[PDB]
Design an enzyme around this catalytic site. Structure first.
Site, PDB file in Angstrom:
ATOM      1  CG  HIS A   1     -33.651 -57.572 -47.112  1.00  0.00           C
ATOM      2  ND1 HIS A   1     -32.518 -58.321 -47.380  1.00  0.00           N
ATOM      3  CD2 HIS A   1     -34.537 -57.847 -48.094  1.00  0.00           C
ATOM      4  CE1 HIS A   1     -32.708 -59.004 -48.494  1.00  0.00           C
ATOM      5  NE2 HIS A   1     -33.939 -58.730 -48.949  1.00  0.00           N
TER       6      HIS A   1
ATOM      7  CB  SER B   1     -33.580 -61.984 -50.130  1.00  0.00           C
ATOM      8  OG  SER B   1     -33.054 -61.143 -51.141  1.00  0.00           O
TER       9      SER B   1
ATOM     10  CG  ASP C   1     -30.115 -58.305 -44.944  1.00  0.00           C
ATOM     11  OD1 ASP C   1     -31.094 -58.329 -44.141  1.00  0.00           O
ATOM     12  OD2 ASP C   1     -30.196 -58.408 -46.185  1.00  0.00           O
TER      13      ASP C   1
END
Ligand SMILES: Cc1cc(Br)c(NC2=NCCN2)c2ccccc12
Length: 264
Positions: free
Chosen positions: A41, A207, A84
Site C-alpha cells: 500500500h 507502514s 499487503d
C-alpha cells in the site's frame, strides 16, 4: 549463507526508509543483497539504508499477486489490506557492513541457524517457536526526529487474539462490517491495546517496516506493518495489523529464490 538478524542504523542495520513523491513515508527491511521487503500500500520512489543520504537505484517493485486495496469496495469496504507485501529489487548489490545487514525471514535456513535449531527443523516448527499461541513480545522500528527507535509490542496470538481482531470494527470504513473476518484475514497478526501491556502504536510512516521477534540475540522478521485502527500520530481499541510472513511464503520463496536465503 549470510548471518541474518545479527547486529542508530548500527542497532537496526536492516531498516530501510521509503519516500514516494506531498511525500508519503514508509519503512522496509533489507532481506538480501538486492531486496527490501515492505508493504504494497506504500505505492519518484526514494529508498535509503544504513542511515545514508543516498537514494538507491530501483530495478522493479514486485507486489503480492493477491493484493488489491480496492478488492472489497463493492461490499462497502473502502480499503482491503489482505496480502499487503511488496519487494523492492535494487539495481546494485548492497555491501553488508556495520550499518547494512539483512534481517532473518521465516522458514529459511538463516532462521533455523539463528534459533540454534537442528537441520530437520520444519517451517511449522519455526512457526511454533516464533509465533506460539500466547502474547508474543515483539518490536517495530519507528523514526523520531530523523533517528530510528525501537518500540516494544505484544502479538495477541493466544486467548487475547479474538479481542485484538474484533477491535478492527473501530477502524475507518470498517464500522458497518458484519463479519470482521472480511477485513481481518488469516494473513494478519495483531498488536496494540493495553493487555497484557500498554503497547505503543504504529504511525502511517511506519507502514511496511518489519514486525520483529528478538530471540537468542537475533532479530527475526515475522510480519510487515500493514494498518492501524486509530491514527495516534489513546483508546484500548487502538490495534495494529501486520502481514504474517508465514502466510505469504509461496510468494516470498518464488521472488527470493535466487537470493541464497535457503528457504525450506
Ligand atoms: C496507522 C494507521 C491508522 C489508520 Br486509522 C489507518 N486507516 C485505516 N486502517 C484500516 C482502514 N483504514 C491506517 C491505514 C494504513 C496504515 C496505517 C493506518
Amino acid at each position: 549463507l549470510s548471518l541474518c538478524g545479527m547486529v542508530d542504523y548500527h542497532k537496526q542495520p536492516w531498516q530501510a526508509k521509503i519516500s514516494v513523491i506531498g511525500h508519503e513515508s514508509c519503512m522496509g527491511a533489507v532481506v538480501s543483497e538486492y531486496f527490501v521487503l515492505t508493504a504494497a500500500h506504500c505505492f519518484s520512489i526514494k529508498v535509503s539504508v544504513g542511515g545514508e543520504k543516498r537514494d538507491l537505484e530501483i530495478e522493479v517493485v514486485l507486489f503480492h499477486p493477491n493484493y488489491n486495496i480496492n478488492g472489497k469496495k463493492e461490499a462497502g469496504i473502502p480499503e482491503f489490506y489482505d496480502y499487503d507485501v511488496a519487494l523492492i529489487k535494487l539495481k546494485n548489490k548492497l555491501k553488508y557492513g556495520q550499518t547494512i545487514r539483512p534481517i532473518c525471514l521465516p522458514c529459511t535456513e538463516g532462521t533455523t541457524r539463528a534459533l540454534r535449531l537442528p537441520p530437520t527443523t520444519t517451517c511449522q516448527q519455526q512457526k511454533e517457536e516464533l509465533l506460539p499461541a500466547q502474547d508474543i513480545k515483539a518490536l517495530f522500528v519507528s523514526e523520531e526526529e530523523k533517528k530510528l527507535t525501537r518500540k516494544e509490542v505484544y502479538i495477541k496470538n493466544g486467548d487475547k487474539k479474538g479481542s485484538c481482531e474484533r477491535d478492527a470494527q473501530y477502524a475507518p470504513g470498517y464500522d458497518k462490517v458484519k463479519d470482521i473476518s472480511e477485513v481481518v484475514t488469516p494473513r494478519f497478526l495483531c498488536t496494540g491495546g493495553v493487555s497484557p501491556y500498554a503497547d505503543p502504536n504504529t504511525c502511517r510512516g511506519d507502514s511496511g517496516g518489519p514486525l520483529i521477534v528478538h530471540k537468542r540475540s537475533r532479530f527475526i522478521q515475522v510480519g510487515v506493518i500493514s494498518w492501524g485502527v486509530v491514527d495516534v500520530c489513546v483508546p484500548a481499541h487502538a490495534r495494529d495489523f501486520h502481514i504474517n510472513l508465514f502466510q505469504v511464503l509461496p510468494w516470498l520463496k518464488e521472488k527470493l529464490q535466487d537470493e541464497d536465503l535457503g528457504f525450506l
